[PDB]
């Protein structure tokens, strides 16, 4: 879903929803990933979308 | 015997207010629009 992932990336950010995603968070999640990750896994009010 | 005159049944209709009753709504976002010039994501490339 790599290629649709981004349309739909572009589709939320272009309606104003600020979504994080690893290949645009890349300099952040580079740090540490699974921080990256457990960032948004711990908080409770950031909406989760799952592409299957 | 004895006439119904007096005690006669009654029939029963409920005074409906659906004549003012408001109307159930159906909400659409006003998608930005990509017809319209939005923006793209700057996929980057090195020339090296």
Redesign the interface.
């Known amino acids: 879903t790599a290629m649709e992932v981004?349309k739909f990336?572009?589709f939320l950010?272009?309606?104003?929803f600020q979504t994080a995603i690893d290949i645009?968070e890349d300099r952040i999640r580079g740090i540490d990933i699974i921080k990256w990750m457990e960032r948004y896994l711990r908080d409770k009010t950031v909406m989760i979308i799952v592409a299957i | 015997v004895r006439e119904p005159g007096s005690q006669a049944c009654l029939a029963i209709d409920p005074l409906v207010g659906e004549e003012g009753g408001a109307a159930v709504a159906k909400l659409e976002p006003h998608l930005q629009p990509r017809g319209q010039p939005a923006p793209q994501p700057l996929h980057t490339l090195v020339l090296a």
Do not use: D, E, I, S
């Not at chain 1, 950010?13 to 104003?16: I, K, P, Q, T, Y």
């Open positions: 981004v990336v572009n950010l272009v309606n104003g645009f």
